[PDB]
């Protein structure tokens, strides 16, 4: 008989969570970084065959990108939202900026 | 995700549109310093790294307040002094510049032709289409007054119909836009663009605009004109340089004012509600937006920080920024400067290109550009959509090598304890979970039934990693205390638990074929083991082998996920594979091998063996039995000595797993086992239970195997999925205990044969020493035996040896000869000359179980190999006619050729060991040239297919609401449920099981009992009357049943072939069970049986074509096969068939001479087809004299073969011929400027000579054998200018181009064999116009393609529709793979559903609702840029769109809302 | 209908959409041989009225652009003559159920 040389030490890997990306903050890739599995196309065209819509929630929103974000009701837009900086004896409030209008905008 | 955190307000659509210059107002940063960093490595205020544009370097934001962890980001304008243009929307300002006229600012078509298009695209912006084509109807140096009454009287049309439509309800406020709809416009703008393209002059004015010039999408050039044009505009209107970029702004801004009435339909789909006007600087660019900080962070490889890639193509255009800035200041103060300045325009507008694209920059043009740009982020396979969106990574997710275990159940995991202690769940801890929850906090991170975080009621984590017991039973002992906070009474803490033995696993195999390769299963945490450990059962659905293959575990983080994951996606219900309803689980190897003993006459146990394998297999704690104490039967031998018989402990182990109040099983099956190999008169190889008792024949890889209606398969019928995954848990430990206790095994002597045997192939193979000869004899037509050595016979067999055709004869004659010998000697000696037999053979066992091998490996082992086959053909041969070194030149014999006779079991010589080599290296080069084959097919299905499901009213539909079948493969039944569907007499033997199962107790008062079979019995008097009719004959009064009441609802609402079978069963079976009440069960089990609402069928559908076309992907055993012929007919819609049929049934009365003399009459004759030689006699002197003599064949030979007279020669050579001949030999000479002796013609004969002496150019002598047709002869003159001429070579090239008799698009028709009664005629190419004047021998009314476009042309949409089923199912019944019909319906339907013959592709994809399913397919820019200009709201209801929305799915568990009923008032 | 032998001259096509309630059918005769409604693969075409049209529509809760199309100048549609928005019905003669009725509209 013979031992063949390669054996199955670096193919296994588990994450419960960790690092992300910064421009999509979804997990990271990598043996070593300890990095998420990918759920493919194909995995994706799977979980709906199944008729299984929560676990196609699951395995592609609620557990890789999920951010509750802020959208205007005005002008339906993501990234024109800012939380305002207040007076130390207010509260901050989350606010448009391109439906907000200038305070030297006074018209009378 | 947390449970705890609820959304109340979502997404439900997404308009498409432009930033305008109003980025002023969001964005108050101006970006105006180029350099990025400064010394001490801060960002310099008005820099791209500038403090406004988010948080950066532990800097609080200027804008947000906030740090790093809470800013969003903030976005930054960067002016631009010019208008520079935008490079996705350029090709269509390049259109609408164009198209207007300088002068009049109108466009350069008539102020009617214009009107007329916004007045049907106004139209088309609703959902009425018959009116758009109701314009046209309206008509009247036409004077003003008409053309503006013609105008007032199309656009009451369209108030008159848009009004009425609108009382209606065809269509809404916000228009009535669908895929059709979307044909129609798209029909329209691009022949609006058309008209708009090659009009000349201004029809409004007179005058005319000079043409413009671009190149690659930098420049606008004003071309110059012609003299013969400059003088038209100058009587009229009177009585190639560049241009700046800014006037190709006010040339389209002063159009855009005149012409919004025409551009107000064009660029909107759906009517312009807010009605804005479309201005023309939403083409051109006044200010960049810039990204924020977070989306721009520096790139670092190794340790080495570099500039962001998004920051070096930017900068770059704010230095441009700059650079135009200093030179306009002396432009302040006032040639060179303007050649900057123009320079500055290029670079300015190739900079903002740059940060676009990155083709559309082209630069320097050195090769392997970098940075590229944010298309290049968008587009590929990589992309973002792709890459980020469609597929994602994933958190709570494992990998591992799997390993294989018996021990576990088939439904099962075993998941190692390095994984079981790290992948947690958020359990809410409550008042019922709070004892277990509490010792999970206790046991901490490294005990396994432990915890690892509480999360408290604010969302604040508490890690448990660091702490001791004291710490976390302090913390345990606190779970259920309130905190006393308002904001979060409703709340409640979380405990993190880890994954224990009732958690839930989606396990995958990596490449997913099909959904079955992605199941759920039940987590068994198994202690000191670092793999994940399957059950063998599960191996046949993820097409695993356990040798280095991994497997995905997904643990799934909330009840809705849970609860799918164990209810719709377990291994218990993907028995049945969706392809053809075949079973795919079953046990394998020596589970197969082991119930041929253990259920063999044999077998006998005592008391203390019996009752040991009963607790062996079914354990009553772990829930096996449905009883509580194992319960036991009498032995079947009582006074010797009580002993218990092998197929009693089958008996016993179904009896304590199937359900106490039902009845027992009744089934009669077959083995793989014939009756022979157990003695005279046994009945060991039919199956029979009775009651649920195995009374006879053993069990096989046919009963508990992946095998169609065996025990495991009628016990998923009868008992449900639960059960009959039980009994393959059941079985599967049964005889893993008892192959441990009594084993297998497999030695030399199983390989031996007995003394007399192995004479016996000694003598066949005797026989085959003069076989090779024999066979060589007959193949070169040489009688009475001669010997090998024949001088005579050695010339003909060498004349073989140089043609391809010729030795594909002689091999295949040879391997016919060989191919007899070799079974006869498996014949004779593998079951009767063996040394050791069936039940204690093992290698006999194996094969004739299904365990594993075939009686054809059992034959190479122990007889002999026999021939060596090599693509089709025998072994190969060198040039000097030699097989090997070894043998004499032209060796007739079979060995010589490859036949090899010797076996595994006595070794090989080496001659047929080096033929063997050969065999076994033709297999691994068929797998080298199979990359990729079927990746791209199926992904090209399932993305058109993806949204495709079943709705509530039984129709078929797509997700934006489209049509597409109105009930599922015809009568709506589910394949995987189908299977016992006409299994009538086991549903009859099994009345009172299966009565129960589909208990109809407490259904009558659910559900319609009479309406349905009322109306049956109608139509099936009425379908019998006119039965022998033909189907243009059928009268329409009454239509199926299925089309007037709803199968779930009316019970006996049934598909008219289940009716039939179901009415034949009952007739032709007289067997206390009535036949009244045996349809009531089957007309039940129909109604049980059905497709359920938002199932979707189309991805099963794809991939119950992409998963065995996998299987289908290998060489020839003519006509397109397997994969090259499957991406012709479901990708590309080829219209151009590599290899176009016609299949042409002939009549009965009609017989085969008759119909081998109609094939000739049909395919093309060459000329060159009956030409024996052409003998030329160039002479020169006197002109050079050409004598072209014709030897033909002989004038029986060739009427004979062709069906040609020797007339239809003479009105071929004189007139088709020899004008082809004088066209080669004028060319030929314009490159080259730059026996029988006869005589005395008649009259005719010179009078035919002299008529074709004036038609041609060089002819002057010509004659032909009008008695025997057996010669012609001409002889031409040329000059004596030209030197040498080959013209024997263009004589060949002219005879292989002249047809005598061809039908045009048809080369070939040839008599196949009659293959089930259709004595058919297959015609090499397709023209039906031909055809059907040939009726006097050929029924047209059958005559059958494969071309689908050619029916579609010729025969409708319906005969292509039937086309498709029938070709897509000749690719798979080749391969003896079946799919059902169910796909294949939806697949033809889904192709014609605009009337036309749609391909999976792009332009298949082009006419559909959905943007986002079209931008994550491919050309991702491109469909966007074909959105934003025509302001699409996309509604998010394709599955592609709800996932880049993160949107719940539509099919399936999101087909439906699920609402709370709340007591109080 | 106008049954014509080898082609029409294009300045007479125009005269084809000339009489607006009317309309005029042009066949070539060649064309006409074999009637192709006869063929086994083309099942039995029934155009509907417009009040079983109506029924159809109601009870599948259609528009008329959401069924599947079948082209103006089909060959079996321009044998019927269907006018655009006329719904057509097809009896199928299905591999797994027997008769099937499915529909299909003229645009």
């Known amino acids: 008989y013979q031992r063949l040389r390669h054996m199955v030490n670096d193919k296994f890997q588990v994450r419960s969570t960790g690092p992300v990306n910064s421009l999509t903050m979804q997990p990271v890739k990598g043996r070593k970084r300890h990095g998420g599995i990918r759920v493919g196309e194909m995995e994706r065209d799977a979980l709906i065959g199944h008729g299984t819509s929560f676990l196609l929630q699951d395995r592609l929103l609620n557990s890789s990108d999920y951010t509750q974000a802020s959208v205007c009701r005005e002008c339906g837009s993501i990234l024109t939202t800012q939380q305002s900086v207040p007076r130390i004896g207010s509260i901050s409030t989350v606010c448009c900026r391109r439906c907000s209008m200038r305070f030297e905008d006074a018209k009378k | 995700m947390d449970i705890s955190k609820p959304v109340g307000s979502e997404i439900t659509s997404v308009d498409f549109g432009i930033l305008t210059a109003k980025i002023r107002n969001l964005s108050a940063k101006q970006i105006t310093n180029p350099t990025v960093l400064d010394n001490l490595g801060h960002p310099v205020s008005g820099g791209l790294y500038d403090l406004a544009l988010g948080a950066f370097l532990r800097n609080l934001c200027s804008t947000c307040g906030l740090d790093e962890k809470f800013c969003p980001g903030h976005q930054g304008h960067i002016e631009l002094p010019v208008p520079c243009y935008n490079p996705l929307f350029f090709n269509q300002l390049y259109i609408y510049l164009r198209a207007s006229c300088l002068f009049c600012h109108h466009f350069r078509l008539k102020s009617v032709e214009v009107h007329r298009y916004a007045c049907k695209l106004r139209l088309l912006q609703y959902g009425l289409i018959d009116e758009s084509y109701k314009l046209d109807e309206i008509t009247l140096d036409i004077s003003s007054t008409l053309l503006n009454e013609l105008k007032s009287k199309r656009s009451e049309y369209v108030d008159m119909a848009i009004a009425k439509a609108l009382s209606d309800g065809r269509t809404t406020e916000r228009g009535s836009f669908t895929a059709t709809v979307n044909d129609e416009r798209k029909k329209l703008v691009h022949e609006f663009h058309k008209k708009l393209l090659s009009r000349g002059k201004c029809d409004n004015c007179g005058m005319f605009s000079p043409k413009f010039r671009k190149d690659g999408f930098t420049k606008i050039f004003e071309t110059a004109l012609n003299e013969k044009q400059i003088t038209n505009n100058r009587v009229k209107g009177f009585i190639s340089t560049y241009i700046l970029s800014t006037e190709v702004k006010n040339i389209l801004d002063t159009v855009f004012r005149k012409e919004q009435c025409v551009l107000q339909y064009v660029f909107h789909s759906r009517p312009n509600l807010s009605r804005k006007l479309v201005k023309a600087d939403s083409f051109f660019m006044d200010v960049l937006v810039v990204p924020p900080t977070r989306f721009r962070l520096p790139s670092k490889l190794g340790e080495e920080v570099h500039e962001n890639s998004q920051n070096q193509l930017l900068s770059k255009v704010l230095t441009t920024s700059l650079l135009i800035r200093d030179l306009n200041d002396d432009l302040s103060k006032l040639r060179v400067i303007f050649s900057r300045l123009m320079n500055a325009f290029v670079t300015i507008q190739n900079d903002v290109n740059a940060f676009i694209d990155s083709t559309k920059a082209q630069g320097r043009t050195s090769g392997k550009v970098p940075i590229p740009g944010v298309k290049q982020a968008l587009e590929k396979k990589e992309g973002l959509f792709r890459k980020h969106m469609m597929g994602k990574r994933v958190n709570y997710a494992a990998r591992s090598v799997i390993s294989p275990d018996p021990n576990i159940e088939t439904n099962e995991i075993g998941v190692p304890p390095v994984f079981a202690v790290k992948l947690t769940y958020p359990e809410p801890v409550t008042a019922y979970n709070i004892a277990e929850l509490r010792q999970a906090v206790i046991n901490g991170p490294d005990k396994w039934p432990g915890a690892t975080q509480i999360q408290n009621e604010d969302g604040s984590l508490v890690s448990l990693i660091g702490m001791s017991v004291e710490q976390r039973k302090a913390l345990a002992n606190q779970l259920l205390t309130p905190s006393s906070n308002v904001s979060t009474h409703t709340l409640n803490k979380k405990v993190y638990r880890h994954i224990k033995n009732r958690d839930v696993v989606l396990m995958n195999r990596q490449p997913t074929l099909h959904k079955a390769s992605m199941m759920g299963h039940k987590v068994r945490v198994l202690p000191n083991e670092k793999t994940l450990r399957l059950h063998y059962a599960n191996t046949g659905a993820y097409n695993a082998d356990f040798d280095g293959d991994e497997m995905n575990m997904h643990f799934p983080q909330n009840e809705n996920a849970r609860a799918e994951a164990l209810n719709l996606a377990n291994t218990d219900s993907q028995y049945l594979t969706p392809t053809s309803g075949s079973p795919v689980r079953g046990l394998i190897q020596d589970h197969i091998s082991a119930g041929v003993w253990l259920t063999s006459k044999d077998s006998f146990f005592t008391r203390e063996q019996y009752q040991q394998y009963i607790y062996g297999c079914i354990r009553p704690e772990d829930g096996h039995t449905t009883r509580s104490k194992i319960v036991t039967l009498p032995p079947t031998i009582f006074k010797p000595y009580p002993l218990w018989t092998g197929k009693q402990i089958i008996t016993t182990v179904l009896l304590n797993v199937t359900p106490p109040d039902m009845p027992g099983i009744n089934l009669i099956s077959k083995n793989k086992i014939k009756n022979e190999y157990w003695g005279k008169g046994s009945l060991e190889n039919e199956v029979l239970f009775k009651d649920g008792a195995l009374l006879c024949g053993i069990l096989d890889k046919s009963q508990y195997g992946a095998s169609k209606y065996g025990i495991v398969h009628s016990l998923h019928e009868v008992y449900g999925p639960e059960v009959a995954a ?740 | 209908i106008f049954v014509y032998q080898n082609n029409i001259t294009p300045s007479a096509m125009k005269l084809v959409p000339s009489i607006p309630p009317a309309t005029i059918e042009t066949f070539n005769e060649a064309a006409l041989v074999v009637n192709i409604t006869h063929h086994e693969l083309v099942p039995k075409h029934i155009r509907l009225s417009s009040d079983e049209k109506r029924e159809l529509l109601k009870r599948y809760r259609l528009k008329e652009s959401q069924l599947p199309r079948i082209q103006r100048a089909d060959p079996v549609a321009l044998y019927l003559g269907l006018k655009r928005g006329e719904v057509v019905k097809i009896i199928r003669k299905s591999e797994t159920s027997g008769r099937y009725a499915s529909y299909r509209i003229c645009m």
């Open chain 2, 726 to 1465: 039980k009994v393959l848990s059941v079985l599967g430990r049964l005889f893993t205990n008892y192959i441990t206790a009594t084993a297998f095994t497999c030695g030399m002597d199983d390989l031996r044969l007995t003394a007399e045997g192995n004479k016996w192939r000694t003598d066949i193979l005797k026989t085959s020493v003069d076989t090779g000869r024999e066979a060589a004899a007959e193949v070169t037509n040489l009688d009475k035996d001669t010997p090998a050595d024949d001088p005579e016979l050695l010339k003909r067999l060498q004349e073989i040896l140089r043609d391809n055709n010729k030795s594909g004869i002689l091999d295949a004659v040879t391997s016919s000869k060989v191919n007899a010998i070799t079974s006869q000697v498996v014949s004779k000696c593998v079951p009767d000359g063996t040394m050791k037999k069936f039940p204690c053979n093992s290698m006999q066992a194996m094969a004739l179980s299904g365990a594993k091998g075939s009686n054809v490996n059992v034959s190479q082992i122990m007889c002999l190999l026999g021939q060596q086959a090599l693509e089709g053909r025998r072994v190969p041969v060198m040039v000097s006619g030699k097989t090997l070194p070894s043998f004499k030149p032209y060796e007739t014999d079979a060995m010589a050729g490859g036949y090899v006779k010797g076996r595994f079991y006595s070794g090989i010589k080496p001659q047929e060991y080096y033929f063997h080599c050969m065999a076994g290296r033709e297999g691994l080069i068929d797998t080298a040239v199979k990359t990729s084959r079927s990746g791209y097919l199926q992904r090209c299905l399932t993305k058109q297919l993806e949204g495709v499901h079943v709705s509530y009213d039984n129709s078929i539909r797509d997700a934006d609401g489209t049509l597409v079948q109105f009930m599922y493969g015809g009568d709506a039944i589910d394949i995987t449920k189908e299977s016992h569907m006409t299994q009538f007499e086991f549903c009859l033997d099994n009345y009172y099981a299966l009565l129960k199962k589909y208990n109809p107790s407490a259904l009558i008062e659910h559900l319609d009992v009479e309406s349905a079979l009322k109306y049956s019995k109608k139509t099936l008097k009425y379908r019998k009357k006119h039965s022998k009719e033909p189907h243009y004959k059928q009268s329409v009064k009454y239509d199926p049943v299925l089309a007037k009441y709803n199968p779930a609802k009316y019970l006996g609402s049934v598909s008219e072939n289940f009716q039939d079978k179901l009415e034949s069963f009952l007739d032709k079976n007289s067997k206390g069970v009535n036949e009244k009440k045996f349809r009531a069960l089957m007309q039940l089990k129909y109604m049980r049986s059905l497709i359920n609402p938002g199932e979707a069928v189309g991805i099963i559908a794809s991939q119950s074509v992409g998963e065995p076309s996998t299987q289908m992907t290998l060489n020839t055993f003519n006509v397109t096969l397997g994969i090259p012929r499957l991406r012709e007919i479901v990708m590309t819609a080829s219209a151009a068939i590599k290899t176009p049929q016609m299949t042409l049934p002939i009549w009965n009365d009609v017989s085969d001479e008759q119909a081998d003399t109609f094939c000739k009459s049909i395919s093309k004759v060459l000329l060159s087809e009956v030409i024996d030689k052409v003998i030329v006699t160039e002479t020169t002197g006197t002109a050079r004299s050409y004598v072209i003599h014709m030897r033909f064949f002989d004038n029986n030979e060739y009427s004979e073969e062709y069906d040609v007279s020797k007339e239809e020669l003479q009105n071929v050579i004189s007139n088709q011929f020899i004008h082809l001949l004088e066209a080669a030999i004028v060319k030929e000479i314009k490159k080259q400027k730059r026996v029988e002796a006869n005589n005395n013609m008649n009259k005719v004969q010179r009078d035919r000579q002299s008529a074709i002496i004036s038609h041609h150019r060089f002819i002057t002598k010509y004659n032909f054998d009008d008695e025997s047709g057996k010669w012609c002869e001409f002889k031409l003159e040329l000059a004596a200018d030209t030197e040498k001429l080959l013209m024997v070579n263009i004589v060949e090239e002219i005879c292989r181009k002249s047809i005598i008799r061809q039908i045009p698009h048809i080369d070939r028709c040839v008599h196949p064999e009659p293959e089930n009664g259709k004595r058919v005629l297959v015609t090499e190419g397709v023209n039906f116009q031909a055809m059907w004047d040939q009726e006097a021998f050929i029924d047209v009314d059958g005559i059958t393609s494969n071309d689908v476009a050619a029916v579609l042309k010729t025969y409708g949409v319906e005969a292509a529709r039937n086309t498709i089923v029938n070709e897509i199912n000749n690719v798979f019944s080749r391969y003896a793979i079946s799919v059902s019909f169910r796909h294949l319906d939806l697949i033809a339907d889904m192709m014609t559903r605009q009337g036309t013959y749609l391909a999976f592709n792009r332009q298949g994809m082009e006419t559909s609702t959905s943007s986002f399913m079209k931008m994550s397919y491919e050309t991702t820019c491109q469909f966007l840029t074909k959105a934003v200009l025509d302001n699409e709201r996309e509604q998010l209801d394709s599955p592609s769109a709800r996932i880049v929305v993160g949107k719940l799915n539509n099919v399936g568990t999101g087909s439906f809302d699920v609402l709370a009923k709340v007591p109080n008032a």
